[PDB]
Amino acid sequence: PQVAGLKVPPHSIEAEQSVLGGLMLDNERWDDVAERVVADDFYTRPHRHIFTEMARLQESGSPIDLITLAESLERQGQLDSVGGFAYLAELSKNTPSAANISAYADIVRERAVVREMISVANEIAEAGFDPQGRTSEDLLDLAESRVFKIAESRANKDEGPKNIADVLDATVARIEQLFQQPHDGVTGVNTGYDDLNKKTAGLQPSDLIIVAARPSMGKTTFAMNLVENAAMLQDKPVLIFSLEMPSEQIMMRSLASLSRVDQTKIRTGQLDDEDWARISGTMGILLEKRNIYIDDSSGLTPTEVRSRARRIAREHGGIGLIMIDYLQLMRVPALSDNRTLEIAEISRSLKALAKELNVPVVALSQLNRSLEQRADKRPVNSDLRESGSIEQDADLIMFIYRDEVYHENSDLKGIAEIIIGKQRNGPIGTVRLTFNGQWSRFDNYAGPQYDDE
Amino acid sequence: RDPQVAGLKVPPHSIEAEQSVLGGLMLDNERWDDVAERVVADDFYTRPHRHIFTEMARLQESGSPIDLITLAESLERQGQLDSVGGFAYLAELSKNTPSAANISAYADIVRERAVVREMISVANEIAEAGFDPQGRTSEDLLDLAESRVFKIAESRANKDEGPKNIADVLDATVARIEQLFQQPHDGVTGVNTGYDDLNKKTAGLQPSDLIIVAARPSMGKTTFAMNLVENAAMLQDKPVLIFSLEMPSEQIMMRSLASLSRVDQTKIRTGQLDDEDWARISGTMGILLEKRNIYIDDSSGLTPTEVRSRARRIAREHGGIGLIMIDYLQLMRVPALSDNRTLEIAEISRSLKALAKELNVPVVALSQLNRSLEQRADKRPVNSDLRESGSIEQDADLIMFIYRDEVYHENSDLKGIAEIIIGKQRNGPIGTVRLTFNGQWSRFDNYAGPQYDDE
Amino acid sequence: DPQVAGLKVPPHSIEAEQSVLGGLMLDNERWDDVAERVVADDFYTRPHRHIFTEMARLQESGSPIDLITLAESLERQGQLDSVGGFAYLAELSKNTPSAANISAYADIVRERAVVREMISVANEIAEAGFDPQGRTSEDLLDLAESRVFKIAESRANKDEGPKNIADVLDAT
Amino acid sequence: PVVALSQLNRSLEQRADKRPVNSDLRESGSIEQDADLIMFIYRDEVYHENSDLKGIAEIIIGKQRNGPIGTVRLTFNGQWSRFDNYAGPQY
Ligand SMILES: Nc1ncnc2c1ncn2[C@@H]1O[C@H](COP(=O)(O)OP(=O)(O)O)[C@@H](O)[C@H]1O
Ligand SMILES: Nc1ncnc2c1ncn2[C@@H]1O[C@H](COP(=O)(O)OP(=O)(O)O)[C@@H](O)[C@H]1O
């Protein structure tokens, strides 16, 4: 066994032989070593067979030694796969030492996260020069999503092995949402509403959520007022893409939201007398809490949504509730790629990248002209008739409808009802936020819902 | 010294292009399910190269993966490293192979440097017969050449012809009239579904078919295809895989734990608000780690060529068949065409039916229908409502269309009665397997709990 | 050499790498839109990169970019020598009469360098991963992280408007 | 002075006016941009029947190096295989 500098994949064999002898003898180090080493880690195929027997018995309230290793393995028939007790007894020579066991749970960890970084630098180089990526810019979009998902909790592999142990524990660890917020300020990024968050239960934290509204409905009014109630409230770098407005026009709206001043006041009868009190109030709390980022370029291919939203999730944790106003402006590189198949590559690259970053992606679209020939003018599912591929690949869908823009003497003035049509992990309903649009703010202390019976 | 390009007795040979086939194979194990497709043994030019791929074969069937290290100990015992090159040679092809780049391109070359190298050495021994006939009555020479030029044979695996007959199938035919072992009067041949209603139309899921679920979107499409894979992991003890392309891993289990255990989802939506049901939770948590059956992978950039490089690395390193479910296959994209869906479906029609016949696995894929159903006054799906698709109406073997009346109406007497219209059926009749939608717990119970049968 | 030597050559499209340099040298009013989609260090071979840098700001800096204005600016910079000589400048000007489809040869050298630089990223992630020096898994998962996003490529100050600079609050 | 002869592909018939434009020899590249006197050939009584240019072919110059372009017409007797004198009609 010569020790030299060669090109070998990194793994240790004695160290795998060191741990398994310890847990064969001891059933008390299992308090420790089950925390930091999981399955799928050991090199040779028999080695994790022993580890699953170490796991199936230890939940079963049965001990582990060289005796019971033979017992279930002939009830399960795997005994001649590992080699019978002819090889398990060679693991009965390893360690009387109950020390360096976590240090041997460390080297077999250390040689197995580098080893999960050779099948990423070959899942790239076998996409290149054998193109299952077929263009350059979407060959980088797969060159990122096998890299940013690594820089993670690091119990993460690339993709493909997930035994139901390694997801059940990370499910119950994500039902540790039990000591903080016993009220229904549910696990998602909040919207800041006690009318919405009983019906949505928050914006569920890995879901593509689609807003749509007509023109003359105030679409970016709601999408910034939801973000401004989710930027000063949940600590995460909220990115915003917007193409309906230019960059500065958004900030001219948000300062009219946070400081509750009129936006007619911001350009006519300017920042003069006592509006300085509120604007210099919200130019301090927004000043250093580095949350809202905004980018507003015009050619936004769905390659260059990911490759802008990767940096945002790199520098931070990143539960950046990405707001992309006006999805139809997103223009794919192929031009003869038409509107039946333009959005069907956008419907399947937001939902497929609202999932890595665990970001509830709010994107914004609009309903066609044939909406406005109905009587009950509500934006329903069958009026997203541009492509019909986003109507079926979203998670939460909120169809905005303000009544006094389409009617005059009716008493539902200023009552925007956010219709929740497609609700996946919950029930449907109907919200009524209060359209206080002279500053573009919504909540329902003046609550337009009946609220009595 | 040797003379110039006029020396061409080396017929073809590719030795520089060979060491970069073993090179990346010495430094990767994920790519043996590719180079074995298009390079078999006895293609290489040099005899030390053949014993390397010889003992790269047994270790891949034994499961032990290959580096420099696990090879040489597996060449220490077998009496090798003396005539294969030595332990320095394995380091000679580890230091001088910098390419962790591409093996799928040097593998095609050694194939097409060997066919030409063999068809030269065929024509040096058929045209040696006229060059020296020592007398074998030339009609009987003519079956030598049929044995020479057709000795180029590639029998690496199962079903072929020549060594094939119908009596060689009739032993396998009486092998699968060896039922009435587990079910003396009761049930199914293949993999179960676990219902009193579905097992008399499909008679279980057939062990090489491609059962297609289709449904109007979020009208109960993953309520079914997880309930069924719930019922088919306590009933098989095999690696019953899942490809959830739509949902994330944390969100799959937060319905199945409400379905295996039948806790209500409001106890898992918010914070858990009972300590009676925690045993109902922790019991079925223990049941689900009593049997390590259900697998999950939540990719979302799935070509239908990289499906095969997952679902063969589960059924090889573990048990056999399982039930390779793939959720919502439009989210699978093929980047080859980037065309109308009437061709991008056609690679998935021709690859899922090429994965349900290597591994003999009932691939439960899922699709949806086009929006023009929403104007047909008989909204129940038929085969003429997959107009977006193309070829999936033909390649499938069991097509289930899931209507649900209470999601498209509110006068529904079918309150919680999800119905299953069997659109295509290969090996049986068609009909309506009406179930009880109890997706409060993500459940589909059976309608013979309620009053009537499956009319 | 035999033709198995197509192994260390990322695609790089020399025919598409010469028709752009013949496109600007005959048409000065195409460097406005071609230099948008194509930047330097996408050109594969060393003469083509620095020639594209020799048009430094020479759109509006008072030089119509022909062979004459190039050759004078080459030698005051000092590179009329064997990084192109002057005969290859005729091979770049007169042998390339290329049409108004430079925007077709623009996307090639955009898309044959991205696929090229995703090989040395796919090498220098992996070749470090076989020789572990005095640095742990917290190094390599954060040196493979940054080295991939060095291939945005580089265009301009973007991706981050408001609070970051925080000045796009103050640009309002 | 090398007369060379060439043909066009059926992309031209996609256009309504079938006059042979300069950008129909671009489809191979080195003939459109190395030609010195392109002289396209049209003829209407083979592409139509009711045209009054019957037998009178119109050579369309598409490029000229050291002079003007235009539309030079020629008459042709449809029996002798001989193109002939001045540009048969008035203009
Ligand atoms: N002074 C104002 N009073 C009322 N509404 C205003 C005022 N200024 C701007 N708005 C609203 O801002 C909205 C712009 O937001 P957006 O959602 O993009 O529009 P739409 O609802 O047409 O999509 C417009 O609908 C307009 O009604
Ligand atoms: N509390 C509930 N009440 C009624 N239905 C529910 C409830 N919770 C979940 N569901 C149902 O679960 C289904 C899940 O939809 P699903 O078929 O998984 O969507 P997809 O087609 O995207 O996979 C929804 O159709 C919804 O009707």
Numbering used by the authors:
A (entry chain C): 19 to 471
B (entry chain D): 17 to 471
C (entry chain B): 18 to 189
D (entry chain A): 378 to 468
Sentences from the paper on this structure:
Chromosomal replicative helicases are hexameric protein ensembles that travel ahead of the advancing replisome, dissolving duplex DNA into templates for DNA synthesis. Melting of the duplex arises from ATP dependent translocation of the helicase along single stranded (ss) DNA, paired with inclusion/exclusion of DNA strands from an internal chamber. To assemble such entities on DNA, bacteria use specialized loading factors that mediate opening of the protein ring, guiding of ssDNA into the exposed chamber, and, finally, sealing of the helicase with ssDNA trapped inside. E. coli DnaC serves as the helicase loader and delivers the DnaB helicase to the bacterial origin; it is unrelated in sequence to λP, the loader that operates at the λ phage origin, and which is the focus of this work.
We report on the structure of the Escherichia coli DnaB-helicase•bacteriophage λP helicase loader complex (henceforth: BP) by single particle cryoEM at 4.1 Å resolution. In the identified complex, we observe five λP loader molecules bound to the helicase at five consecutive DnaB subunit interfaces; the sixth DnaB interface has been breached, thus precluding a sixth λP from binding. The λP loader restructures layers in the DnaB helicase comprised of carboxy-terminal (CTD) and amino-terminal (NTD) domains into novel right-handed open spiral configurations. Restructuring breaks one of the six helicase subunit interfaces to produce ~15 Å and ~20 Å openings in the CTD and NTD layers, respectively; these openings are of sufficient size to enable access by ssDNA to the internal chamber of the DnaB-helicase. Furthermore, reconfiguration forces the CTD layer of the helicase into a restrained inactive conformation wherein the ATP hydrolytic and DNA-binding properties are diminished, if not abolished. Each λP protomer is comprised of a helical domain that binds in a deep gulley formed by an interface between two adjacent DnaB CTDs. Further, each λP protomer sends out a lasso-like segment that runs along the edge of the CTD and positions a λP helix against a site formed by the CTD and the linker helix (residues 183–194) of an adjacent DnaB subunit. Although our EM samples were prepared with a large excess of ATP, we observe that five of the six sites in the BP complex are occupied by ADP, while the sixth site, whose composite architecture involves subunits that span the breached CTD ring, lies unfilled. Taken together, our findings indicate that the λP helicase loader induces a conformation of the DnaB helicase that is neither optimal for DNA binding nor ATP hydrolysis. However, binding of the λP helicase loader is not compatible with the dilated form; indeed, the NTD and CTD tiers of the BP complex, by virtue of arrangement and size of internal chamber, are found in the constricted form.
